[PDB]
Amino acid sequence: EGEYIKLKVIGQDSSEIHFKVKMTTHLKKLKESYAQRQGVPMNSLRFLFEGQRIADNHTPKELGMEEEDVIEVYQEQ
């Protein structure tokens, strides 16, 4: 079985929530969880990896993510 990697999600206010995901995980599931925990609609947010938009069906493998990589969350434009 594949291992989880731990990603740090940083919000507009510098708060952090870490997520464990597999390399094959579609990141919509992370986005949904994050939005839930912030008490806001998922479509009000955009999630960036190294400044690039993370798609619902992006995986960490597709994005070249590794342990301790950072996702930033901004308001949708």
Partner: peptide, 17 residues
């Protein structure tokens, strides 16, 4: 804040509805 780690889990004939 305390550390927060969330585990994202992977992606029927018993059903009754």
């Amino acid at each position: 804040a305390e550390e927060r780690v969330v585990v994202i889990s992977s992606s029927n004939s018993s059903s009754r509805y």
